[PDB]
Design a protein around this nucleic acid. Structure first.
Ligand SMILES: [Mg+2]
Ligand SMILES: [Mg+2]
Ligand SMILES: [Mg+2]
Ligand SMILES: [Mn+2]
Ligand SMILES: [Mn+2]
Ligand SMILES: [Mn+2]
Ligand SMILES: [Zn+2]
Ligand SMILES: [Zn+2]
Lengths: 827, 827
RNA sequence: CAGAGUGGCGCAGCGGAAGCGUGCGAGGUCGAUGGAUCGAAACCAUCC
RNA sequence: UCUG
């Protein structure tokens, strides 16, 4: 058998001794020549179908040789093209000959998915009748034929005869429906056994037909087989067994076997029995019939394995993320932008952390990076763990180099040398390359070299020059495949990519939403939790600036909460104020007004809606913009909000697509919204909560949601500290974490407890919700975090005065978490 | 030579005598065998590339014979598939052998454009270096190669040498970049000259390479050619001339020629000059290099012609109604819906006219139609005229039969037997079939039979059974291709299809528009001329009833003009009234109000807008719907309309896509809207007319715009009557025509004047705009025709009392025509 | 435009099979691959 | 691969 070599960062199949050179291979005997050719072609097919690799063969002479015409032609047949260089490149050194094989297909969703076949095969074992000849279907023909099958005569006169005259002439020729065969003179039963697989499947795959055995096909003479040579019952039994032995694959019901009529008739010479002639009528088969199992190979674990018939048909007829595939170019430009003329280290925060914790690491890396002038060096605590592989103690970090005029290199940094370091690095590089091809959908020639570096005080293959990243196009394509690969795993870079995907989804929804600016002066925006209400408000204030050409301070933003007010003020896109400040001060200078979280306003301090109406109507350019954003699921009090009735809240816009939270958080939000609908708060007008989220909408961004109950306050705080420490060690910054509590009164108690639990984790700095721009964890109440978001949120003991409002507080908490949400309910 | 036979309704190529049968073809000399094969393959390639046809060949034997293995294999090579039955079917009758060829690709926009090449070829003449061998690209390979090009070494150490030593061993083998040749005799010059065309193009197309002439293949020793056989100057001249003789095609700029380096180096023997060795370095070429012209054939005019290199590359790399292509299925189910279980005649009005005009036509057709149980028979005055061919006097009618278990048949009915009737029918059927394939994109096996019928009391070819319409799928696909074909011509059916296309575009825009119903209670809809405003209003009322579940009489429609009132009222979708009636009467039972053409309202009778506000505000579902449709380009007076200010007209919806007029009418409306914008009326709001048509929007519907000036009134009347008579002869109805005049005072004059002409055309029935549902020509004023539309409009002498109102009239007139507009201005 | 590639060397076969002349019983799978044929070096195609 |  063929076995993949284990100590390489690629798929490497050793095919042993092979005779190379056209003269050398012509001097061989055909049997050994064909055996060597078949070995090489099985290896090539497996590598084509398994993501690419290297074929290693020892050559018997030192001097450079040509591969050979038969091997060339077999590779051409394998890829159905004369463009060998697109998939095969050879190098040779000393007594070694290498064939570097590119993947035939890459990714779960190729562009050519409906155009080209998924596999390469040495043979498909599919035959069809083409006029008077039987022709094997190549990979493309078999693909089309299986697609067709999957989508939902004077010969009969002779067939009806119960006997034939020796030397009789049949009145028709061979055709699409008729075949004439003579009997072999030597081995009659072996001959029929050989003949049935060639012709019966071909007729079955195309309209059926007649097979006459014992007929000269040049004369159409009936000859048959001498009775001394054949026994009709044995012949019939052999024929039937051969026909029933043929593999068949059904795309339908019922799955009845091949339908055929077999007649053995007497051949009478001068009216007396001379011999027997065989006639088979093959009726058209509903689906594909194979002469035998297809000759297609693939790499499974560490072995080169042939595909079964049904597995082959499944591949030929049939955690990935569609959002990554859709946005790969934008995501790559955002995170992995490749600069001109200098080498970039990312993530910068993790790089700075690593060089601070480890002495000489910066010098080691900078020394190793001297040869490379342009590219990106992507760091990580453990690329192995990033790819769902086992962590290795002693590995300081891993770095992936993607630089111009170089192949991808995975670096593993060790504090001190270890025996398993090289094996660990090779395993990680192999996994990364296979992911880049099979999950990331990279269609080029790719290799990842595994190099182990040490801090304290098998040989790599030389790949062809086509495996070095030539320039910007190659680097960007490889980095987009890397984006797709990373989005399928849990890691720091994966979470950053998920944040950017959520931002892109919000941008799409905002592009749709902003068309309402030209069409409404007053507008009531009813957004659902996680629908991006506040992002929409900020972007619409920006757009108002450019559309009405008014100076930024002419636009006013009103909200209920000081933390949200401060967050909006930090961007300088407008003037931001709280309901109380808005009602107290004077704003005749304001043209346009945007009100957010209007469901949380209150009437005691005045008629804010009337004041906003007056201010916007007294504008110079007609009645100014007055857009009121609100979300009735996120009501924080049972009092009157001061909004107009639901009948008078027109014109209306609905933000129903969740674009701000990962998939688990969005599902939790939907369930909580349904619970709210079942038990609505009585201050909300009856018909408000009948807004339903988009039925088939999903974010395609993976996140985290854990509910940890029955814990004490001390246990909760210890768990929070441990999780935060793990995130920070992996490379998350503190400013991506928020701890939200039941009420503002418990904030100080839980703050002291969190500091007690965190002083063990080397960080002692917390922040209030009013300082979102600081590099610290924010601890506050769910109420005071309205409109603000963090990647990681810890929800501690969500509870309120009215059990009816507890689902509301759960929604308000869950909607603040973008990717990771930890809830610690009461017990 | 090969010429298509003229007597047939298909492309028929006569290839003459051909030897058929494998045993008979083996007896031939190779020269004759190959000549016959080449002739048959030229015919097959031409038919594949020209929409299909029949190859006729006379065979030398009476009895049936198989085609022959070489012919089978050539056909398989031509279609790059063993599925011969998909494109070729054979029949033989006595001494004639027929090959029925299907089109390779159909239509200007095939669904597989990016996958398969548009042409079949005998050879592409494109060669690539494939390791150590040169291979020609098949059609698919060349398609991919030209698609790629269309986008905007130790060998060098031996090449750089000034001289070589006899017996020197080259240290490299033949490879992707190196080719060795060794000619040892006289004729060395001819050998290298004919070596150039096969190796230089391959290297040029495949990244360049080296050609060493004078190197032993097996040992790689430099031997060269004895001095006495080679003259270096002459050799260089031949090599350069051969290289520059190679055809090249450029997709780029600059179109620089092929770049190469040629060296004739001295081969020394112990320091003594022995001979010459020739070395060529071929650099990669920007584009495709051909060894010769491609071998591809096509039928143009009556000849089978070979494509030139440039035409072949164009066809391999590069009226057609795209709207028809998009909507073919809906258009077919609308106009050519095939019924189950009976034969349908269309158009029904034209059929009735024909059988009323001609005695015995009904029995003739019904007796001819007995064999057919299911299908459709499509009548016309002249299908030849419909297909832009010449009209033939004596043809009563043409009918296209599309029935199950039959081939398409075009019937030509003559009043009396004629000699040229069969030629006319055959030409029409040939044109129809060729259009169905090359313009309607029909990818099945299609033939149109041509039968001539006589009202007064070359043999046809028998097609394979696969050309008969098996059932619903084939008949519907053929009728959809017919829809596409008809939409590219002028005819009654083409106009009906264009009307349905306009309706489908309006329906798409209404689906986009109706989403505003949930979001708005008050809405001001600002439509441009031809934007479907009234259709939107009607459909929105229909949706209001369905969504609010209120009875139709609860919805009120208010307009300015009695004819539009009547037209809307007859729909029974609502209560419809005029402005004055609305002010006068009581409407407390009304929930919703829709107001159309609001810019034409007047303030004299009262505050209609205030009344509508009051009525709608007090509905059960809160404030009721109050949608006000209006178009300021279509104003009818200089007086105040009573609408609220433009700033107060919010929220707004703008209908900017023209969906109710054909392309010429839409372009005319766009041109005149600029004239309006140049000088708007003083009563019109300042900024309202700043709305613009959708930039890249086109209906894709053919229409007619004719402006006939410098004519007197009787000339106008005669032209109108003549055009109406021509339309009615072709089969149009009088209810498709409107004659619009400047004012109602001139209506009485023009009505008598128009009758004075129509009494010569045998129509004496006219009506005003209030009888739009009758079977008569409508004559009325342009303003009185507000909100209504007809397929054919004659606009006569537009006029007004003030130049300030003059600009609107031409738009207000042109917007009322759907497909045909005739304007008769002053002069 | 055609032809040739079978014992070290030169060569005949022309549908059932490995032989002749030279060189000394030995010496080749009839240039390679694929195809038709019940069946080949022999018929067909492509390639070197 | 070579030859006429
Ligand atoms: Mg013989
Ligand atoms: Mg052979
Ligand atoms: Mg066989
Ligand atoms: Mn046969
Ligand atoms: Mn070679
Ligand atoms: Mn060579
Ligand atoms: Zn089946
Ligand atoms: Zn070029």
């Amino acid at each position: 058998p063929l076995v993949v070599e284990p100590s390489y960062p690629d798929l490497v199949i050793n095919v042993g001794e092979v005779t190379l050179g056209e003269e050398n291979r012509k001097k061989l005997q055909k049997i050994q020549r064909d055996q060597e050719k078949e070995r090489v072609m099985r290896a090539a097919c497996a590598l084509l179908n398994s993501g690419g690799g290297v074929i290693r063969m020892a050559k018997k002479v030192e001097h450079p040789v040509e591969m050979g015409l038969d091997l060339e032609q077999s590779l051409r047949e394998l890829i159905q093209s004369s463009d060998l260089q697109a998939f095969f490149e050879t190098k040779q050194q000393g007594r070694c000959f290498y064939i570097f094989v590119k993947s035939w297909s890459s990714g779960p969703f190729p562009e050519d998915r409906s155009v080209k076949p998924r596999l390469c095969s040495l043979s498909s074992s599919l035959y069809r009748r083409s006029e008077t000849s039987v022709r094997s279907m190549d990979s493309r023909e078999a693909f089309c034929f299986l697609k067709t099958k999957r989508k939902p005569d004077p010969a009969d006169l002779i067939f009806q005869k119960d006997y034939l005259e020796y030397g009789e002439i049949l009145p028709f020729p061979e055709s699409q429906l008729v075949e004439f065969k003579q009997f072999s003179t030597k081995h009659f039963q072996e001959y029929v056994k050989r003949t049935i697989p060639e012709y019966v499947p071909a007729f079955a795959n195309t309209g059926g037909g007649y097979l006459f055995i014992g007929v000269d096909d040049k004369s159409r003479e009936v000859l048959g087989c001498a009775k001394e040579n054949v026994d009709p019952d044995s012949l019939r039994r052999k024929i039937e067994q051969a026909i029933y032995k043929l593999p068949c694959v059904h795309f339908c019901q019922p799955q009845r076997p091949i339908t055929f009529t077999l007649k053995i008739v007497n051949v009478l010479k001068r009216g007396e029995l001379y011999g027997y002639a065989c006639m088979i009528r093959v009726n058209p088969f509903c689906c594909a019939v194979f002469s035998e199992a297809p000759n297609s190979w693939i790499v499974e674990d560490k072995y080169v394995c042939s595909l079964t018939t049904e597995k082959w048909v499944g591949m030929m007829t049939d955690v990935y993320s569609k959002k990554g595939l859709e946005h790969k170019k934008e995501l790559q430009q955002l995170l992995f932008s490749v600069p001109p003329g200098y080498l970039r280290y990312t993530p910068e925060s993790l790089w700075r952390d690593l060089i601070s914790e480890h002495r000489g690491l910066e010098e080691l890396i900078n020394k190793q990076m001297q040869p490379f002038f342009r590219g990106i060096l992507i760091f990580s605590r453990s690329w192995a763990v990033d790819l769902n592989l086992q962590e290795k103690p002693g590995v300081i970090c891993d770095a992936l180099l993607i630089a111009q005029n170089s192949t991808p290199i995975l670096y593993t940094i060790l504090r001190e040398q270890d025996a398993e370091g090289q094996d660990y690095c090779t395993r990680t590089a192999f996994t990364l390359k296979q992911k880049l091809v099979n999950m990331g959908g990279y269609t080029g020639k790719v290799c990842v070299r595994a190099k182990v570096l040490c801090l304290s005080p098998v040989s790599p293959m030389d790949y062809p020059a086509s495996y070095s990243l030539a320039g910007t196009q190659h680097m960007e394509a490889l980095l987009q495949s890397l984006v797709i690969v990373l989005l399928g795993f849990r890691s720091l870079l994966s979470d950053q990519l998920g944040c950017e995907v959520l931002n892109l989804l919000t941008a799409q929804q905002y592009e749709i939403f902003s068309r309402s600016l030209r069409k409404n002066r007053e507008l009531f925006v009813h957004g659902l939790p996680g629908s991006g209400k506040t992002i929409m408000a900020m972007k619409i204030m920006e757009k108002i600036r450019n559309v009405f050409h008014c100076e930024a301070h002419r636009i006013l933003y009103v909200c209920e909460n000081q933390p949200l007010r401060n967050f909006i003020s930090d961007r300088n896109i407008c003037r931001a104020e709280t309901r109380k400040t808005f009602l107290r001060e004077n704003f005749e200078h304001i043209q346009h007004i945007v009100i957010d979280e209007a469901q949380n306003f209150r009437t005691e301090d005045g008629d804010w809606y009337g004041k906003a109406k007056s201010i916007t109507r007294r504008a110079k350019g007609g009645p100014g913009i007055l857009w009121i954003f609100l979300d009735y699921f996120q009501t924080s009090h049972l009092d009157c909000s001061g909004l107009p009735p639901l009948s008078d809240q027109y014109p209306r816009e609905e933000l129903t697509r969740i674009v701000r939270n990962a998939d688990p958080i969005a599902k939790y939000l939907q369930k909580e919204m349904q619970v709210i609908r079942s038990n609505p708060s009585f201050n909300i007008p009856t018909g408000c909560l009948e807004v339903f989220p988009e039925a088939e909408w999903s974010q395609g961004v993976q996140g985290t949601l854990r509910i940890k109950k029955y814990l004490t306050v001390e246990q909760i705080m210890t768990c929070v500290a441990d999780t935060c420490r793990r995130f920070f060690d992996r490379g998350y910054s503190p400013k991506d974490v928020a701890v939200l509590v039941s009420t503002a009164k418990e904030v100080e108690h839980y703050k002291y407890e969190l500091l007690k639990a965190m002083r063990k984790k080397r960080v002692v700095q917390l922040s209030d919700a009013c300082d979102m721009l600081g590099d610290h964890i924010v601890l506050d109440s769910v109420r005071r975090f309205s409109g603000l978001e963090r990647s990681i949120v810890f929800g501690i003991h969500p509870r309120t005065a009215d059990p009816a409002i507890l689902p509301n507080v759960l929604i308000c908490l869950a909607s603040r978490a973008k990717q990771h949400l930890y809830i610690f309910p009461w017990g």
